[PDB]
Design an enzyme around this catalytic site. Structure first.
Site, PDB file in Angstrom:
ATOM      1  N   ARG A 151      55.112  48.936  69.062  1.00  0.00           N
ATOM      2  CA  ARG A 151      55.912  49.931  68.371  1.00  0.00           C
ATOM      3  C   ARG A 151      56.128  51.190  69.208  1.00  0.00           C
ATOM      4  O   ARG A 151      57.073  51.941  68.975  1.00  0.00           O
ATOM      5  CB  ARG A 151      55.270  50.260  67.027  1.00  0.00           C
ATOM      6  CG  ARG A 151      55.438  49.149  66.027  1.00  0.00           C
ATOM      7  CD  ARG A 151      54.365  49.146  64.983  1.00  0.00           C
ATOM      8  NE  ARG A 151      54.633  48.101  63.995  1.00  0.00           N
ATOM      9  CZ  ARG A 151      54.170  46.856  64.069  1.00  0.00           C
ATOM     10  NH1 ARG A 151      53.394  46.487  65.080  1.00  0.00           N
ATOM     11  NH2 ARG A 151      54.477  45.978  63.124  1.00  0.00           N
ATOM     12  N   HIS A 327      62.593  25.236  69.158  1.00  0.00           N
ATOM     13  CA  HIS A 327      62.531  25.690  67.769  1.00  0.00           C
ATOM     14  C   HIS A 327      63.249  24.682  66.863  1.00  0.00           C
ATOM     15  O   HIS A 327      64.384  24.293  67.156  1.00  0.00           O
ATOM     16  CB  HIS A 327      63.098  27.111  67.653  1.00  0.00           C
ATOM     17  CG  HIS A 327      62.412  28.095  68.554  1.00  0.00           C
ATOM     18  ND1 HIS A 327      62.815  28.320  69.855  1.00  0.00           N
ATOM     19  CD2 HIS A 327      61.324  28.879  68.357  1.00  0.00           C
ATOM     20  CE1 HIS A 327      62.016  29.214  70.414  1.00  0.00           C
ATOM     21  NE2 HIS A 327      61.103  29.569  69.526  1.00  0.00           N
ATOM     22  N   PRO A 328      62.586  24.242  65.769  1.00  0.00           N
ATOM     23  CA  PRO A 328      63.125  23.173  64.924  1.00  0.00           C
ATOM     24  C   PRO A 328      64.377  23.653  64.207  1.00  0.00           C
ATOM     25  O   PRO A 328      64.355  24.729  63.616  1.00  0.00           O
ATOM     26  CB  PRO A 328      62.008  22.926  63.902  1.00  0.00           C
ATOM     27  CG  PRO A 328      60.805  23.618  64.433  1.00  0.00           C
ATOM     28  CD  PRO A 328      61.311  24.757  65.243  1.00  0.00           C
ATOM     29  N   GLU A 357      63.539  20.410  57.602  1.00  0.00           N
ATOM     30  CA  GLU A 357      64.761  20.269  58.381  1.00  0.00           C
ATOM     31  C   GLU A 357      65.744  19.251  57.774  1.00  0.00           C
ATOM     32  O   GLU A 357      66.905  19.572  57.563  1.00  0.00           O
ATOM     33  CB  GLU A 357      64.436  20.001  59.857  1.00  0.00           C
ATOM     34  CG  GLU A 357      64.768  21.187  60.801  1.00  0.00           C
ATOM     35  CD  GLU A 357      64.280  22.550  60.296  1.00  0.00           C
ATOM     36  OE1 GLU A 357      65.126  23.377  59.848  1.00  0.00           O
ATOM     37  OE2 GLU A 357      63.052  22.789  60.360  1.00  0.00           O
ATOM     38  N   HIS A 360      68.016  20.178  54.892  1.00  0.00           N
ATOM     39  CA  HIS A 360      69.257  20.828  55.305  1.00  0.00           C
ATOM     40  C   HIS A 360      70.345  19.815  55.516  1.00  0.00           C
ATOM     41  O   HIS A 360      71.408  19.934  54.907  1.00  0.00           O
ATOM     42  CB  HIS A 360      69.084  21.650  56.575  1.00  0.00           C
ATOM     43  CG  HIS A 360      68.253  22.870  56.384  1.00  0.00           C
ATOM     44  ND1 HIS A 360      68.600  23.867  55.500  1.00  0.00           N
ATOM     45  CD2 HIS A 360      67.084  23.253  56.948  1.00  0.00           C
ATOM     46  CE1 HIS A 360      67.677  24.814  55.524  1.00  0.00           C
ATOM     47  NE2 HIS A 360      66.745  24.465  56.395  1.00  0.00           N
ATOM     48  N   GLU A 384      67.512  27.338  52.936  1.00  0.00           N
ATOM     49  CA  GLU A 384      66.052  27.313  53.082  1.00  0.00           C
ATOM     50  C   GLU A 384      65.315  26.928  51.787  1.00  0.00           C
ATOM     51  O   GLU A 384      64.263  26.266  51.826  1.00  0.00           O
ATOM     52  CB  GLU A 384      65.542  28.677  53.551  1.00  0.00           C
ATOM     53  CG  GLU A 384      65.867  29.013  54.985  1.00  0.00           C
ATOM     54  CD  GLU A 384      65.171  28.074  55.933  1.00  0.00           C
ATOM     55  OE1 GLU A 384      65.857  27.172  56.467  1.00  0.00           O
ATOM     56  OE2 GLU A 384      63.930  28.212  56.110  1.00  0.00           O
ATOM     57  N   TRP A 459      59.202  55.370  55.577  1.00  0.00           N
ATOM     58  CA  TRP A 459      58.798  53.982  55.814  1.00  0.00           C
ATOM     59  C   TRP A 459      57.333  53.821  55.395  1.00  0.00           C
ATOM     60  O   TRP A 459      57.034  53.127  54.425  1.00  0.00           O
ATOM     61  CB  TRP A 459      59.041  53.619  57.292  1.00  0.00           C
ATOM     62  CG  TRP A 459      58.571  52.269  57.753  1.00  0.00           C
ATOM     63  CD1 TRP A 459      57.451  52.000  58.489  1.00  0.00           C
ATOM     64  CD2 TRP A 459      59.213  51.011  57.535  1.00  0.00           C
ATOM     65  NE1 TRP A 459      57.350  50.647  58.735  1.00  0.00           N
ATOM     66  CE2 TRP A 459      58.416  50.018  58.159  1.00  0.00           C
ATOM     67  CE3 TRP A 459      60.387  50.621  56.875  1.00  0.00           C
ATOM     68  CZ2 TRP A 459      58.755  48.673  58.144  1.00  0.00           C
ATOM     69  CZ3 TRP A 459      60.722  49.284  56.857  1.00  0.00           C
ATOM     70  CH2 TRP A 459      59.907  48.323  57.490  1.00  0.00           C
ATOM     71  N   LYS A 463      55.459  51.725  52.637  1.00  0.00           N
ATOM     72  CA  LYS A 463      54.496  50.680  52.959  1.00  0.00           C
ATOM     73  C   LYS A 463      53.189  50.889  52.205  1.00  0.00           C
ATOM     74  O   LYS A 463      52.569  49.916  51.765  1.00  0.00           O
ATOM     75  CB  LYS A 463      54.244  50.593  54.459  1.00  0.00           C
ATOM     76  CG  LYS A 463      55.200  49.649  55.190  1.00  0.00           C
ATOM     77  CD  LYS A 463      54.624  48.245  55.303  1.00  0.00           C
ATOM     78  CE  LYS A 463      55.537  47.309  56.082  1.00  0.00           C
ATOM     79  NZ  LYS A 463      55.645  47.751  57.493  1.00  0.00           N
ATOM     80  N   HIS A 487      64.539  40.679  62.708  1.00  0.00           N
ATOM     81  CA  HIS A 487      65.737  40.710  61.856  1.00  0.00           C
ATOM     82  C   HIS A 487      66.405  42.058  61.795  1.00  0.00           C
ATOM     83  O   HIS A 487      67.644  42.139  61.632  1.00  0.00           O
ATOM     84  CB  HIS A 487      65.392  40.271  60.446  1.00  0.00           C
ATOM     85  CG  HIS A 487      64.630  38.998  60.414  1.00  0.00           C
ATOM     86  ND1 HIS A 487      65.190  37.811  59.995  1.00  0.00           N
ATOM     87  CD2 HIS A 487      63.368  38.710  60.809  1.00  0.00           C
ATOM     88  CE1 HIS A 487      64.290  36.849  60.103  1.00  0.00           C
ATOM     89  NE2 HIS A 487      63.177  37.369  60.598  1.00  0.00           N
ATOM     90  N   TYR A 497      65.078  36.243  52.150  1.00  0.00           N
ATOM     91  CA  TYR A 497      63.700  35.753  52.081  1.00  0.00           C
ATOM     92  C   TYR A 497      63.049  35.925  50.703  1.00  0.00           C
ATOM     93  O   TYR A 497      62.166  35.149  50.334  1.00  0.00           O
ATOM     94  CB  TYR A 497      62.845  36.307  53.227  1.00  0.00           C
ATOM     95  CG  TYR A 497      63.417  35.933  54.592  1.00  0.00           C
ATOM     96  CD1 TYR A 497      63.397  34.616  55.030  1.00  0.00           C
ATOM     97  CD2 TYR A 497      63.993  36.888  55.424  1.00  0.00           C
ATOM     98  CE1 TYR A 497      63.928  34.248  56.236  1.00  0.00           C
ATOM     99  CE2 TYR A 497      64.519  36.527  56.661  1.00  0.00           C
ATOM    100  CZ  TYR A 497      64.483  35.195  57.047  1.00  0.00           C
ATOM    101  OH  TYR A 497      64.981  34.793  58.254  1.00  0.00           O
TER     102      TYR A 497
HETATM  103 CL   LIG Z   1      55.868  48.409  61.085  1.00  0.00          CL
HETATM  104 ZN   LIG Z   2      65.204  25.659  57.530  1.00  0.00          ZN
END
Ligand SMILES: [Cl-]
Ligand SMILES: [Zn+2]
Ligand SMILES: CC(=O)N[C@@H]1[C@@H](O)[C@H](O)[C@@H](CO)O[C@@H]1O
Ligand SMILES: CC(=O)N[C@@H]1[C@@H](O)[C@H](O)[C@@H](CO)O[C@@H]1O
Ligand SMILES: CC(=O)N[C@@H]1[C@@H](O)[C@H](O)[C@@H](CO)O[C@@H]1O
Ligand SMILES: CC(=O)N[C@@H]1[C@@H](O)[C@H](O)[C@@H](CO)O[C@@H]1O
Ligand SMILES: CC(=O)N[C@@H]1[C@@H](O)[C@H](O)[C@@H](CO)O[C@@H]1O
Ligand SMILES: CC(=O)N[C@@H]1[C@@H](O)[C@H](O)[C@@H](CO)O[C@H]1O
Ligand SMILES: [Cl-]
Ligand SMILES: [Zn+2]
Lengths: 597, 173, 597, 173
Positions: A151, A327-328, A357, A360, A384, A459, A463, A487, A497
């Site tokens: 960070r 990566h799958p 997988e 999908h 997902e 932030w 948190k 992201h 998510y």
């Molecule tokens: Cl953080």
């Molecule tokens: Zn997936």
């Protein structure tokens, strides 16, 4: 011929031209990921440039047809989709610069490294360098070092860039008649015209916040138990009424508590659910892993994989000499060409990974017959969600038995089940306040509700308040901790998510109900239940075709995201928790920090 | 002289399909019946022999093959090759990925996707004139002007439904 | 000393004496009904005379206390119940004679035998001989025989006695300031002085019928559906528009269509919901039934049966040499002495009955806490409803699974559901018109509205109108078909079975709310619900110390009986019956006769 | 000398309870510790030893046993046998169905159900005088006059709470 007639003819010409450029784009992009040559990166760019240029050209043309002059969802929806204006709504320089920012944030997070002050000859990346530490190290200070380094080096670097990113990105969303960039992102969940099936952008926050309250009790208990457990692994570092030091949570950010399992496991005596070794005993190769996955999906009445999948998929790493990214992924190239690229190892985690997988591919296959522009999950939270479903049924001790992988004598005593359920909560429940919080900040930053001079101040305040988590070192506005996660600094909405996580339990419960499953929702297995497949295929075949509300109601029988199934899954753990915490504090003080002062 | 039809080194694009008239001849049809070489072999008349005919060649996409039957929604039926309502003989299709597709892309095969009104059975539209959905002459790059003919794009790697299929339609009078 | 004062002491005295006499009466009465010896009929009479005389001697003395001057309601009700004039209000001869009629009718019924026209040595008693024929024969003629012999032999015998019983019982009714014996019986439901909780005698007729109108559509279909099915069973004996022939309904009178299940089952390839075969196969016995039903009430929070219950109950037929009355009965002898008398057979109906009966016992234990005079059901219908509440939960496939009368793998779908709801309907719904119609006739007769020369004519008119049932042969007024029922010739009000079935579902709807039950009402099993147990018990222990109207309101939140719950319970079946019935006549003509030929 | 109280062939009615004096004696007490024979063994003193007493005997019904303890609400404690609010030793009781109850009905045991005022502790009323709730000497069969001693009636078949129980109260000083 009206506006609507002139629109269909316009769209039709699109779909056909799009199929070719996009197929070429995909095959080129695939060949790269499977055969990393300098001749290939040249081709992936070649085909990716045409296909992108084309989209732009088309959208600009598509804007020459007004969408409220159309009483026909199907076409109206297509025209709307193609009206991804882009950063082309901005000026020449506010577009080049923004793309400059976008790319630099990306390349910094990807190339950023930090070096051991006690041994500066060894500089570590995130993957696999720092990441390994954050997952396995039991040394508070080593952990503190990595956490802070990341960070402090790449964080501070992204700070200025992120600031300009927010201004530039906001202008765009304003110029597209949205409140802010946040509002732009919430857009993905919006529905206009159908009645009751409608959904506004703001209704999302509402439905997220309302549904999140109903999660606190569980999370607080999860938190309280892990706090107790952590006190043991780092005595004297942690307060029994305090937040959890941010750098002790299992990974670089504490997005998942997964790796805390070793030191939070409820019944350490009980052995594996891990069939990793059981699989090897029978010399199983990739062919069997997927044939099995395939057999799983055929069991619920869905189709075999396509001959082309078996012919064109990459099931095993060639090693050196022809190297590939590992990566799958599930690839939907177009022209009925489906395939998976996955460097299959022989673990249980990979056996299960195949089931995700291949979910999908099953989804992608189902919605093939839809208009080109409409082939995708109902929302960002759908693909997902379908993926995880498959992972859930496959891992049940019932299912491993059925396959001939679990010893048929192993019984489900109260302890192996809480063990596993905790492991589940460490990842699934653990990540929900973190995910909500992250977007909560992001959203507020885009509204102006959190000024530049209070970015980090707000932030960490959140948190602490929302997540139960604290900075082990204090951070002034020289930092930009959020952007130190993939992201954020790579411009992807993060709320999927959360919404997914709930969707997937909604799906499960309703699919298990359809499947007459008797016990706790967590032992469920939709395997062999065709009527489940039918209930699933009903929304699987929709794609982006009809509003996600109806898409959901097709499988669950309700027009909204409901958190109730999520709780249900973790109900037997929740009781244990409430009792294990009999004499533990449950909740946190936002005031205590580890550096103190 | 049927081998001069099936096994012809090249095939026509659907929109410009070929009619080859066969008269004063005797055939067994055994050369056809027995063969897993044929993916589709659907007759719409009978299944016997008389030793007596039109042969229509062309290429379409796997998924299009269904449109080469009486009835059928359209695009290939609607604008390219239309079978008649009742009247009929046989229809033969087969996978030609190895011949008519490449790993690079093969775009020689054309079909028509725009037209004012559908075709009549056995009608044939060879024209290539810029198109606007309300008549009127057309001059692209203009908006709402399009070229009515599209390229198929057949690649080795695609799904079966997207692979090229050489089709032969036999007609009886 | 005052008045309320002097009253207490009297009641206290009455109480302690009553107990002693009433126990001796029961223990007598019992030993007879379990051993019909000559010396036992003697004793049973004796104590029962010393008990009735006592109450009579005490009733007079009760009247000497001006009740409308007492401000404690607890004592007034006790005082009020003791102020009962009974039948000694008739003269000397009119009392011995009535008691002789009653006794003879009882004995004509219990001793009736029919002997085969083709065998003057084989004779059959109602139980088991005739009854077996009616529950099981597929032979039109055999059933016709049994049905008619019974009404020709016993029925004609009873006719003269019944006529004279009418007159003498009316005389007693009017002497006790009641309209007729009909009004007398209707009295049980009456409440005076409470406001909003009062209930008048003539108000019950109003209510039964108001509520019966609502049941008509459901019964009508049930009827239609069973008619079609009986047509396949008995080719060409039934009109597709005619009433069902009365010797074909499964028992001697068509009180219950239960035995029509095997030939009406909706989906017969499904795993049988009639667990009779299951029970036989697993070699269950009476002990197992009752011990199993005890376990059910423990699970909701109620006590076991008492050491005395197990030691003293008669759960099986002794055979010949020691002979008993087999009518299932729930005995509350006094001084906490509870038992069940039942000749348990290994069938499902007996399994269900065990629960019902034990239901009664559990109710009796609950209100043992009360003043002697108040130790009873809230009205004649409460006891029967309580029985049936239990029977409701135990009959669910869910519960059969749980006891292991259904495979643990047994999977519930909509077909098993329909089978179940159908079987439930055959018993529950199908008795409604029969019961309502039986009473109305009686009621009307007592009211005088029906003359002797039309007694049978009006019965059979009403069988056709209301029940949609027709006599297979015509019956002049030598006949007395109602008296062929135990309840008619043994002087027992019937409407209780009607009110019972309403209260039944009322109670259940409230009880499943308590057990936090998920779906439709017919799927509710209150097992393991201490919460649901608690609710029920709370209204159980009140005994007769409360007007049924308020007592009911405290359980379910309603002043009166309500049909809505019943209707909801059957809805899925109603909807299914409507569609099943699309190819047949729904309703009936009253004019078709099996004999008008 | 304890096995002469418990183990006594006969026991008296509550209203007419007997008291045995115990002085100048050694008792081990183990005769009472070592026993699952006793359905009730409540001590409002302790459970120890000094080798040093008053034993009160009488028969009461199951549910009446709970009144043989300090405090206690009515009828047996009120008109029959009252223990003092503090002052106490042990209270033993045991089920005697097969001794004091007959399957035909045993009515020898009496109790007083009407009295002109509660008893003080350890009082004993022996009178059989007809009761009137307002003074008034009585003569049956006159109304509002009652004979105040009721019979128990102990049958073999009753519930446990209605079965007879022999009870012995030990007092210390
Ligand atoms: Cl953080
Ligand atoms: Zn997936
Ligand atoms: C009338 C209607 O609402 N449906 C049609 C649908 O059949 C068709 O697929 C589409 C053309 O792209 O146009 C309309 O939406
Ligand atoms: C305190 C009071 O005055 N109430 C009493 C009540 O306790 C008693 O149980 C009842 C029985 O006679 O009479 C009165 O209602
Ligand atoms: C406490 C209770 O009410 N239940 C008991 C149970 O404990 C016991 O194991 C069983 C065997 O006799 O009898 C009763 O069911
Ligand atoms: C009626 C019912 O569902 N009974 C269940 C029983 O099946 C289960 O084995 C037992 C043990 O927890 O608890 C419950 O009483
Ligand atoms: C004689 C009578 O009925 N008295 C009862 C008494 O037994 C009980 O202990 C009390 C509790 O509230 O209520 C009444 O006063
Ligand atoms: C005009 C258009 O493109 N619509 C098509 C049409 O060919 C078809 O008949 C109909 C089926 O209901 O819906 C669409 O698939
Ligand atoms: Cl009858
Ligand atoms: Zn009953």
């Amino acid at each position: 011929s009206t506006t609507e007639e002139l629109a269909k003819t316009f769209l039709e010409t699109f779909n056909y031209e799009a199929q070719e450029l996009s197929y070429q784009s995909s095959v080129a992009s695939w060949n790269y990921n499977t055969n990393i040559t300098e001749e290939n990166v040249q081709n992936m760019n070649n085909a990716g440039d045409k296909w992108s240029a084309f989209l732009k050209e088309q959208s600009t043309l598509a804007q020459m047809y007004p969408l409220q002059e159309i009483q026909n969802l199907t076409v109206k929806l297509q025209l709307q989709a193609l009206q991804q204006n882009g950063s082309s709504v901005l000026s020449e320089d506010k577009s080049k610069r923004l793309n400059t920012i976008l790319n630099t944030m990306s390349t910094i997070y990807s190339t950023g490294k930090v070096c051991n002050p006690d041994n500066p000859q060894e500089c570590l990346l995130l993957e696999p360098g720092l990441n390994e530490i954050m997952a396995n190290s039991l040394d508070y200070n080593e952990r503190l070092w990595a956490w802070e380094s990341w960070r402090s080096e790449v964080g501070k670097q992204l700070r200025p860039l992120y600031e300009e990113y927010v201004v530039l990105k906001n202008e765009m969303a304003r110029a597209n008649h949205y409140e802010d960039y946040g509002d732009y992102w919430r857009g993905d969940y919006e529905v206009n015209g159908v009645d009751g099936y409608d959904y506004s952008r703001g209704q999302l926050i509402e439905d997220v916040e309302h549904t999140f309250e109903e999660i606190k009790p569980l999370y607080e208990h999860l938190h309280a138990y892990v706090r107790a457990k952590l006190m043991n692994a780092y005595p004297s570092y942690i307060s029994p009424i305090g937040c959890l030091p941010a750098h002790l949570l299992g990974d670089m950010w504490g997005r998942f508590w997964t790796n805390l399992y070793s030191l939070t496991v409820p019944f350490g005596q009980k052995p594996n659910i891990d069939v990793t070794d059981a699989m090897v005993d029978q010399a199983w190769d990739a062919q069997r892993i997927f044939k099995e996955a395939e057999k799983f999906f055929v069991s619920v009445g869905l189709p075999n994989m396509t001959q082309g999948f078996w012919e064109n998929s990459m099931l095993t790493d060639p090693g050196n000499v022809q190297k590939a990214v590992c990566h799958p992924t599930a690839w939907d190239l177009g022209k009925g060409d489906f395939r998976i690229l996955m460097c299959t190892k022989v673990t249980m985690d990979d056996f299960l990974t195949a089931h995700h997988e291949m979910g999908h591919i099953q989804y992608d296959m189902a919605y093939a017959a839809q208009p080109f522009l409409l082939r995708n999950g109902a929302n960002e939270g759908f693909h997902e969600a379908v993926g995880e479903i498959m992972s859930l049924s496959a891992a049940t001790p019932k299912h491993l038995k059925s396959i001939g992988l679990l010893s048929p004598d192993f019984q489900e005593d109260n302890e192996t089940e809480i063990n596993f359920l905790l492991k589940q909560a460490l990842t699934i429940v653990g990540t929900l306040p973190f995910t909500y919080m992250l977007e909560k900040w992001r959203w507020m930053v885009f509204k102006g509700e959190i000024p530049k001079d209070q970015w980090m101040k707000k932030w960490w305040e959140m948190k602490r308040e929302i997540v139960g988590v604290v900075e082990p070192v204090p951070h002034d506005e020289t930092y930009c901790d959020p952007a130190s996660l993939f992201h954020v600094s790579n411009d992807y909405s993060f709320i999927r998510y959360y919404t997914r996580t709930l969707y997937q339990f909604q799906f499960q419960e309703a699919l298990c109900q359809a499947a007459k499953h008797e016990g706790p929702l967590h032992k469920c297995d939709i395997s062999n239940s065709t009527e489940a497949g039918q209930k699933l295929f009903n929304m699987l075949r929709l794609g982006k075709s009809e509003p996600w509300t109806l898409a959901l109601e097709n499988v669950v029988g309700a027009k909204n995201m409901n958190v109730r199934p999520l709780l249900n899954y973790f109900e037997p753990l929740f009781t244990w928790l409430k009792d294990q915490n009999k004499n533990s504090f449950v909740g946190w003080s936002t005031d205590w920090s580890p550096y103190a002062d | 002289p049927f081998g001069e039809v099936f096994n012809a080194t090249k095939f026509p694009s659907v929109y410009a399909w070929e009619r080859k008239k066969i008269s004063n001849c005797v055939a067994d049809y055994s050369v056809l019946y027995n063969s897993t070489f044929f993916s589709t072999f659907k007759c719409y008349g009978v299944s016997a022999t008389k030793l007596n005919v039109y042969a229509d060649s062309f290429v379409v996409k796997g998924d299009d093959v269904r449109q080469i039957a009486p009835g059928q929604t359209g695009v290939i039926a609607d604008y390219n090759y239309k079978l008649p309502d009742d009247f009929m003989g046989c229809v033969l299709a087969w996978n030609t990925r190895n011949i008519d597709a490449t790993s690079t892309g093969n775009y020689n095969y054309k079909y028509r996707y725009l037209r004012h009104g559908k075709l009549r059975p056995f009608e044939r539209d060879i024209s290539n004139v810029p198109f606007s959905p309300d008549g009127k002459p057309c001059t692209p790059p203009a908006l709402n002007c399009y070229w009515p003919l599209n390229d198929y794009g057949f690649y080795t790697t695609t799904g079966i439904g997207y692979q090229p299929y050489r089709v032969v339609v036999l007609s009886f009078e």
